[PDB]
Structure 1
Amino acid sequence: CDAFVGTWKLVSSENFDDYMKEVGVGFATRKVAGMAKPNMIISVNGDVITIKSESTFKNTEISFILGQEFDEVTADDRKVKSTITLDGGVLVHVQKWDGKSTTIKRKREDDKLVVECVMKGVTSTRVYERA
């Protein structure tokens, strides 16, 4: 996938604190992550997609191949098993840990990058626009 290629800036966010709460993020990290306004910078070299999120709070980065499970340390220090695929133009990213799982979908919508984060019954939506 490449229509995702570019530098993206968070412009709106709903339910992110609830989402983080359900995932199990401690209060102190929620407070600083919630206020954060990260850049998500996505690139692709052949079959390796790289995604970087930068903020004063924390920078993270993952590089992966569609369909191949990899170990991820998250911004909230969970050690998860991640598997990201491309489904009908949507990048679906799944993280598995302690028998729990959360799904993060990234999709292009007009000129936005829309991110839907789901944990159990909570759904958070985050909108990023080209910088």
Structure 2
Amino acid sequence: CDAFVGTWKLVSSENFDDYMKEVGVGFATRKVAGMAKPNMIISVNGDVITIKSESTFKNTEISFILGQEFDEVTADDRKVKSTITLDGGVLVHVQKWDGKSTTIKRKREDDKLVVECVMKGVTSTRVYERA
């Protein structure tokens, strides 16, 4: 994951409120979470990948091994079971909770890190650049 490593800052978002609604995030959380302009900090140490999000809303940190399920408490306070794989150069993060599922894909595109969040038919695109 060398081309993902580093510190990234959110520079644009599209359809994130709609994604959050599809996920089931409530009003107040959507409004405060939607304002945030997080940094995402990605590091690797052996087989362990760490993705931290720092924002004025809700700091988060996950550490994981590719293909190995883990517990995650998301920023909106879902308790999910997550599995992250690297498929064709794209980090693919599946979250399962309450019989539901959402997939977050992270990919490098030019000098950007593009984050696509999909819940059913709804996609949000979040673009990060190096901090």
- Fold agreement, TM-score > 0.5: yes
> Which structure 2 segments of 5+ residues have no match?
none
How much does 1:121 deviate? 1.0
Q: Point out 4+ residue stretches in structure 1 off by more than 3 angstroms.
A: none
How much does 1:114 deviate? 0.3
How much does 1:56 deviate? 1.1
Find the counterpart in structure 1 of residue 29 from structure 2: 29
**How many Å separate the matches in 2 of 1:2 and 1:100?**
31
Identity %: 100
How much does 1:57 deviate? 1.0
**How many Å separate the matches in 2 of 1:118 and 1:5?**
23
**How many Å separate the matches in 1 of 2:35 and 2:56?**
10
1:1-131 counterparts in 2 under 5 A?
1-131=1-131
How much does 1:58 deviate? 1.2
Count of aligned pairs: 131
Q: Deviations over 1:39-86 (max 9, x none)?
A: 000000000000000011110000000000001000011010000000
Other structure's SS at 2:56 match: coil
Other structure's SS at 1:68 match: coil
Q: CA RMSD in A?
A: 0.5
How much does 1:2 deviate? 1.9
**How many Å separate the matches in 2 of 1:36 and 1:70?**
26
